[PDB]
Amino acid sequence: SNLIEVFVDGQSVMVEPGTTVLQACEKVGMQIPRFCYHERLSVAGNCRMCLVEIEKAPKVVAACAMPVMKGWNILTNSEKTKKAREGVMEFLLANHPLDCPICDQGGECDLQDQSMMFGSDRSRFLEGKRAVEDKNIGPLVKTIMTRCIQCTRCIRFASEIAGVDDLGTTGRGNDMQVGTYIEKMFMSELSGNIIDICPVGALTSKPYAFTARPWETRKTESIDVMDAVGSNIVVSTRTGEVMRILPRMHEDINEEWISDKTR
Amino acid sequence: ALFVHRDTPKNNPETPFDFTPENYKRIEAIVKNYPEGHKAAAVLPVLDLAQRQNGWLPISAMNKVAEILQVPPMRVYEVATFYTMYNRKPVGKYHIQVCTTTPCMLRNSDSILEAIQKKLGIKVGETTPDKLFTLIEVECLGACVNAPMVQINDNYYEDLTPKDIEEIIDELKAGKIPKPGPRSGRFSCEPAGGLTSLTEPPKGPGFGVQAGL
Amino acid sequence: KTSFGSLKDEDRIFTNLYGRHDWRLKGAQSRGDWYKTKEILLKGPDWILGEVKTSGLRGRGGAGFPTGLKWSFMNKPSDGRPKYLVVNADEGEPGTCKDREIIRHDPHKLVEGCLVGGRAMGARAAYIYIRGEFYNEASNLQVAIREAYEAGLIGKNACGSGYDFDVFVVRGAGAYICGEETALIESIEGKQGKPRLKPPFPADVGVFGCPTTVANVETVAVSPTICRRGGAWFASFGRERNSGTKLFNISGHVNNPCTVEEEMSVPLKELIEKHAGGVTGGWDNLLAVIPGGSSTPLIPKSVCETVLMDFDALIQAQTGLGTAAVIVMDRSTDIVKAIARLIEFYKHESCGQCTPCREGVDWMNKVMARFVRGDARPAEIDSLWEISKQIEGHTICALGDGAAWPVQGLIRHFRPELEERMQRFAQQHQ
Amino acid sequence: PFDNTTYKNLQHHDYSTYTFLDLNLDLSKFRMPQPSSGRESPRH
Numbered sequence: 016s017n018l019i020e021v022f023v024d025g026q027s028v029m030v031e032p033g034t035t036v037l038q039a040c041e042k043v044g045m046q047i048p049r050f051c052y053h054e055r056l057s058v059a060g061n062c063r064m065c066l067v068e069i070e071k072a073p074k075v076v077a078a079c080a081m082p083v084m085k086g087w088n089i090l091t092n093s094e095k096t097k098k099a100r101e102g103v104m105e106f107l108l109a110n111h112p113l114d115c116p117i118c119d120q121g122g123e124c125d126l127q128d129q130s131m132m133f134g135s136d137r138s139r140f141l142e143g144k145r146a147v148e149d150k151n152i153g154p155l156v157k158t159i160m161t162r163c164i165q166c167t168r169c170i171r172f173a174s175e176i177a178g179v180d181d182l183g184t185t186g187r188g189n190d191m192q193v194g195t196y197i198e199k200m201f202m203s204e205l206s207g208n209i210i211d212i213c214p215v216g217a218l219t220s221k222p223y224a225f226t227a228r229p230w231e232t233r234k235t236e237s238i239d240v241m242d243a244v245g246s247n248i249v250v251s252t253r254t255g256e257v258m259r260i261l262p263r264m265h266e267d268i269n270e271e272w273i274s275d276k277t278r
Numbered sequence: 279a280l281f282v283h284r285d286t287p288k289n290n291p292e293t294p295f296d297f298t299p300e301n302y303k304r305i306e307a308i309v310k311n312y313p314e315g316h317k318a319a320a321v322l323p324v325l326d327l328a329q330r331q332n333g334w335l336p337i338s339a340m341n342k343v344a345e346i347l348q349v350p351p352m353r354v355y356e357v358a359t360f361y362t363m364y365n366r367k368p369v370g371k372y373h374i375q376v377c378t379t380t381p382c383m384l385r386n387s388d389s390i391l392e393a394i395q396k397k398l399g400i401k402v403g404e405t406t407p408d409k410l411f412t413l414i415e416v417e418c419l420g421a422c423v424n425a426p427m428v429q430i431n432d433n434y435y436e437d438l439t440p441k442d443i444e445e446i447i448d449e450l451k452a453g454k455i456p457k458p459g460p461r462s463g464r465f466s467c468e469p470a471g472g473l474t475s476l477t478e479p480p481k482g483p484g485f486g487v488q489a490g491l
Numbered sequence: 492k493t494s495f496g497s498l499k500d501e502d503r504i505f506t507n508l509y510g511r512h513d514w515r516l517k518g519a520q521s522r523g524d525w526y527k528t529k530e531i532l533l534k535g536p537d538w539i540l541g542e543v544k545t546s547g548l549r550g551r552g553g554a555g556f557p558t559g560l561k562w563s564f565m566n567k568p569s570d571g572r573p574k575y576l577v578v579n580a581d582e583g584e585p586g587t588c589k590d591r592e593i594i595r596h597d598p599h600k601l602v603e604g605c606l607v608g609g610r611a612m613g614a615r616a617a618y619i620y621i622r623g624e625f626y627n628e629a630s631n632l633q634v635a636i637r638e639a640y641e642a643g644l645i646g647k648n649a650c651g652s653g654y655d656f657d658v659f660v661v662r663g664a665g666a667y668i669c670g671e672e673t674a675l676i677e678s679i680e681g682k683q684g685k686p687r688l689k690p691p692f693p694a695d696v697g698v699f700g701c702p703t704t705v706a707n708v709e710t711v712a713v714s715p716t717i718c719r720r721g722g723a724w725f726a727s728f729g730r731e732r733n734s735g736t737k738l739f740n741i742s743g744h745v746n747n748p749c750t751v752e753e754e755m756s757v758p759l760k761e762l763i764e765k766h767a768g769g770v771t772g773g774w775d776n777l778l779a780v781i782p783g784g785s786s787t788p789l790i791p792k793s794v795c796e797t798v799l800m801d802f803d804a805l806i807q808a809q810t811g812l813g814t815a816a817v818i819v820m821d822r823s824t825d826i827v828k829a830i831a832r833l834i835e836f837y838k839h840e841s842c843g844q845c846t847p848c849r850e851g852v853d854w855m856n857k858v859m860a861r862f863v864r865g866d867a868r869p870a871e872i873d874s875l876w877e878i879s880k881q882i883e884g885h886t887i888c889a890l891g892d893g894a895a896w897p898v899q900g901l902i903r904h905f906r907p908e909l910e911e912r913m914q915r916f917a918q919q920h921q
Numbered sequence: 922p923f924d925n926t927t928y929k930n931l932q933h934h935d936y937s938t939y940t941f942l943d944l945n946l947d948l949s950k951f952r953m954p955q956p957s958s959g960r961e962s963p964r965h
């Protein structure tokens with residue numbers, strides 16, 4: 016067995032070579048915070064939320080991208096890892112809009128939850144925030160691009176899984192904008208899964224828009240019937256009425272996606 | 279100064295654009311500089327060639343480059359919005375690029391910017407009504423010992439004064455082309471008061487060749 | 492040897508730096524370029540890499556990595572993929588205008604450097620990523636590359652050594668980020684110039700996925716002069732781990748802003764007073780010096796008196812060597828305005844890929860724009876220090892580090908001028 | 922007769938907008954055959 020031995024917070028875990036640091040911490044049940052890493056998209060390494068300390072090495076590494084080497088001691092809860100997480104969360108909330116009440120992603124937002132868990136509790140930002148032009152990519156995805164944190168799960172989805180290549184980053188710097196650069200309509204058969212994998216409220220479900228809110232939704236784990244694939248879904252109801260259909264993770268049918276007919 | 283496209287009557291995918299056949303020869307020569315299967319590597323020189331033919335990029339040059347290289351249009355849109363040379367609006371024929379970073383600002387490029395603003399009658403970003411001149415304010419152009427300097431479409435005009443850039447703009451309005459260099463007494467990059475180095479002739483080939491070569 | 496500087500005209504690698512001689516083949520052959528190149532190439536990669544590791548040549552791009560150890564990462568067996576040398580000719584750094592001079596005035600030295608370096612690493616060809624603003628330099632280098640092909644010096648049967656080596660020039664499109672090696676690779680691949688993450692270092696996955704070395708024009712062009720003159724000769728200039736000669740760009744507030752070649756550990760006061768004709772107003776008019784281009788922290792007059800212009804002494808002087816591009820600033824300088832415009836540069840040239848640079852560099856520019864007017868209170872200086880320390884070390888490439896460093900140098904050496912700016916703002920507006 | 926007084930680099934005063942690419946077309950025959958990845962693009 017060509018497994019190599021590493022350490023996660025001192026605890027020895029065995030990994031196949033080529034294992035990322037994030038997966039080495041997943042193999043002891045610790046989830047490193049992340050925004051741009053998605054386990055079915057390719058690795059981008061461009062939110063820097065997974066910056067974790069390797070001891071006897073004076074620089075935090077991007078755990079989503081970094082393959083482990085032999086004998087590392089990964090420090091997920093050390094001081095400079097927490098300073099990295101708090102600083103990166105401060106830059107993510109520097110120009111994010113105060114839209115948490117009028118946002119559908121509230122209650123089921125990644126940015127809110129790991130701002131609460133791994134971020135600070137106040138702002139040092141004293142300037143005016145940016146504002147981004149909204150886009151019309153169709154009747155299914157409500158686009159409010161001020162909330163976008165540029166994690167590029169859009170482009171990796173529509174370049175790898177959807178195979179469409181309509182999305183990209185136009186511009187440069189803080190004015191870089193995820194979009195299509197034209198009034199072009201993103202209608203794939205899988206086009207609604209960018210509502211799933213957007214960690215923020217930049218891409219929301221326009222039919223589900225403004226109607227409900229996740230903590231009061233009752234989750235019911237059911238099956239698709241819209242085709243013969245049998246996608247596993249959540250039919251989430253609120254007080255006796257169907258609100259939306261989310262996917263379930265089933266590793267052998269619909270890995271964590273559904274078609275737009277299903278959704 | 280925006281990073282989206284809105285279809286005007288003068289910028290749409292039905293705006294006429296196509297290469298001359300010598301530009302198709304040049305595009306084949308560009309694509310031959312890159313390995314097979316990496317035809318997408320030649321987005322930048324072919325789109326730059328489209329700018330050299332048209333003066334600026336409508337969204338038909340981007341789509342034509344995406345058609346001939348068999349890449350998506352979005353991947354050419356990313357390139358044309360990423361870089362500060364791909365002019366996505368029709369600039370004037372002389373594109374005055376004044377450098378205003380810290381080494382040019384220490385040697386008073388602001389006087390040159392004010393002199394161009396009062397000599398042309400425009401400000402930063404605008405275009406003169408004859409559509410010959412467009413003045414924008416750019417970052418470091420890499421001529422720092424020859425600061426302050428400008429760039430006019432291809433050419434560095436260096437070691438400038440306000441009077442030197444007035445004189446260059448005057449001989450541009452006469453329809454000629456000036457000499458792309460410094461406007462002080464020196465030639466390229468030597469000390470202005472005289473040669474502090476390289477005074478002697480070179481030694482020729484073979485000087486100091488170690489034993490065994 | 493304890494005294495450094497006073498580099499003589501015979502030990503200059505970049506003879507014809509000034510364009511005073513013929514840059515073409517008939518001039519470059521009269522100066523030592525393309526002499527015994529066949530006997531350099533026939534002696535294998537191992538002898539070339541031994542002479543470069545002998546010569547103590549570090550990274551002339553600015554980071555200062557040991558060049559021969561870097562090039563030996565390509566000295567590895569072939570696994571189907573070709574190998575490439577890539578020559579970093581972007582040169583977007585404020586203060587830095589020397590590789591423009593190497594391309595424009597000694598181009599055959601660069602082409603012979605491409606040939607010897609690609610032979611040292613088994614590289615198939617050479618992509619020279621020149622800046623798109625350097626159009627005359629690019630046509631100039633393509634003329635010299637045509638002269639090298641028509642003489643049979645490169646290409647099929649390079650210099651009669653039986654090696655095949657093309658030399659390409661790829662023009663940029665106006666992005667300072669495409670001088671970083673992986674963003675440059677992406678700019679060759681027809682994509683946005685967004686830097687990759689390391690590892691993979693380009694010796695494993697570089698341009699087009701091939702093994703690749705990206706080196707500066709200066710540390711490529713001085714390599715045939717090293718392989719001709721020997722390693723220990725070039726190692727006998729400058730201090731130890733500071734071996735050799737260096738092109739300095741003494742810009743800013745001097746009487747003669749110039750590009751000159753000097754020994755590696757020359758004093759800064761001696762360099763400014765000996766080649767640039769001194770600071771405008773004498774040495775008693777100096778205020779600060781940005782020693783090696785914009786990404787290095789400034790240092791005041793009390794440090795620039797005794798400091799040496801190499802890697803180790805400037806790291807001990809809490810800055811970096813960098814590109815060795817000297818920016819001289821006198822007492823008539825609004826220095827906070829200068830550093831704020833430099834941060835404005837580093838947000839107009841920043842590709843927006845990862846979070847800390849994309850947001851924090853714009854946020855530092857807004858804080859510095861309020862510091863120029865004084866529209867702040869003195870907690871925000873330490874706040875800006877913590878912002879810069881959160882950008883530093885948390886990015887993908889060192890543009891975040893190279894943007895946090897001018898802020899840290901400015902705060903560290905000129906906190907009281909910021910504080911008195913803010914307090915006179917507070918008295919005159921309230 | 923040696924000359925350390927004149928700027929010999931005067932050839933770039935007459936360059937045109939198509940100079941670089943005319944030089945690339947003039948060099949397109951001096952170059953080795955490009956290596957292949959076997960496929961026409963990574964989407965083939």
Ligand SMILES: NC(=O)C1=CN([C@@H]2O[C@H](COP(=O)(O)OP(=O)(O)OC[C@H]3O[C@@H](n4cnc5c(N)ncnc54)[C@H](O)[C@@H]3O)[C@@H](O)[C@H]2O)C=CC1
Nearest residue numbers: 552553554556582583584587670672692786813814888889
């Ligand atoms: N010359 C110019 O115009 C400019 C130069 N710079 C300089 O660039 C410096 C930053 O350099 P960077 O490219 O960001 O990185 P640098 O820290 O990593 O590394 C230098 C070189 O060594 C290689 N390298 C480093 N560590 C390695 C390892 N463990 N294994 C294999 N290869 C390794 C890298 O690939 C790179 O080519 C700044 O400090 C500044 O001085 C910055 C801007 C402009």
Ligand SMILES: Cc1cc2nc3c(=O)[nH]c(=O)nc-3n(C[C@H](O)[C@H](O)[C@H](O)COP(=O)(O)O)c2cc1C
Nearest residue numbers: 550551552579581582583670671672706707889890
């Ligand atoms: C933002 C950024 C810009 C850079 N720009 C250049 C450049 O324009 N030219 C250059 O030679 N190196 C540049 N570098 C340094 C390169 O990454 C690399 O270290 C160098 O080109 C080759 O290494 P060397 O110093 O051994 O030559 C830049 C680095 C960064 C982080």
Ligand code: SF4
Nearest residue numbers: 114115118121124216
């Ligand atoms: S995306 Fe998240 S953090 Fe942003 S407004 Fe919505 S709930 Fe709040």
Ligand code: SF4
Nearest residue numbers: 163164166167169213
């Ligand atoms: S819209 Fe959402 S998924 Fe797309 S890049 Fe922005 S934050 Fe990521």
Ligand code: SF4
Nearest residue numbers: 843844845848886890
């Ligand atoms: S730190 Fe800045 S320059 Fe580097 S990859 Fe990120 S956006 Fe780009």
Ligand code: FES
Nearest residue numbers: 051062063065079
């Ligand atoms: S998760 Fe590793 S950087 Fe985004």
Ligand code: FES
Nearest residue numbers: 377382418420421
């Ligand atoms: S600062 Fe203007 S050219 Fe470099």
Ligand SMILES: [K+]
Nearest residue numbers: 210213215218
């Ligand atoms: K979402």
